[PDB]
Amino acid sequence: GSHMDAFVGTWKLVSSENFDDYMKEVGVGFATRKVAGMAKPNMIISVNGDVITIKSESTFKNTEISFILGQEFDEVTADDRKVKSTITLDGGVLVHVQKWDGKSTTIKRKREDDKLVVECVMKGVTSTRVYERA
Ligand SMILES: O=C(O)c1ccccc1C(=O)[C@H]1c2ccccc2S[C@@H]1c1csc2ccccc12
């Protein structure tokens, strides 16, 4: 077993705050913001050995990333950015940094009670997305 197994499972989005504003800051265009903003993704997190997989499934897009903590990888985001991603587990928080075009955004995922809370930050703008078990 591992600490990381607190995140494993199938999660459904229950609330969102400031996600349109976050996407604006990231540089997502109007039409993508509208359709992505309507998405209610389910997030499936699994671990096999050292490899963590996070899959997000919705009517907008289905995406999947697999990675080893601390080891950079190339990722194509749901909004079609080509980014360099590094994911670490710091003090029980999964911290995902994406770098592209001289820009950076950080996505933190934390357990809080029966929720999985996702905080996305792009410069000064934070979006909070709350998931519960499916
Ligand atoms: O939805 C989240 O909770 C989330 C948080 C951080 C990173 C990715 C996500 C996602 O799940 C992303 C995703 C992936 C597949 C299907 C639908 C969605 S909505 C969201 C997303 C759409 S454009 C964009 C542009 C920037 C960031 C997210 C996003």
Numbering used by the authors: -2 to 131
Quoted from the paper:
Fatty acid-binding proteins (FABPs) are involved in the uptake, metabolism and intracellular trafficking of fatty acids. Based on epidemiological studies and animal knockout models, the isoforms FABP4 and FABP5 were identified as potential diabetes and atherosclerosis targets. The aim of this study was to develop a dual FABP4/5 inhibitor and, to this end, high-throughput and fragment screens were conducted with X-ray crystallography as a follow-up method on those ligands that showed appreciable affinity and favorable physicochemical properties. Structure-based drug design (SBDD) based on initial hits from high-throughput and fragment screens yielded 216 ligand-bound structures of human FABP3, FABP4 and FABP5 isoforms, many of which were at resolutions of better than 1.2 Å.
